[PDB]
Design a protein around this ligand. Structure first.
Ligand SMILES: [O]
Length: 82
């Protein structure tokens, strides 16, 4: 629910992308018509886990690298914040 973590499974498109951008670990925009959009990834939520790995505290370059090098399945657990 509103306060709670949610886990979203996405699949990469033909160029290896799932459909979002982020900054300082927070998702900031979803790409229209993407896997992220279809599967309900949310903006203003922090990236907690990717493919079951906790990434809290990692810098953006590392989160980016994990996303870019992932296989086609990308599962992300996200968390709201105030
Ligand atoms: O997390």
């Amino acid at each position: 629910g509103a306060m709670d973590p949610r886990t979203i499974t996405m699949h990469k498109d033909s160029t290896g992308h799932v459909g979002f951008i982020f900054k300082n670990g927070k998702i900031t925009s979803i790409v229209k018509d993407s896997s992220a959009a279809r599967n309900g990834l949310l903006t203003e939520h922090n990236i907690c886990e990717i493919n079951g790995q906790n990434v809290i505290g990692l810098k953006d370059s590392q989160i980016a690298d994990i996303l870019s090098t992932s296989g086609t399945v990308v599962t992300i657990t996200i968390m709201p914040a105030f």
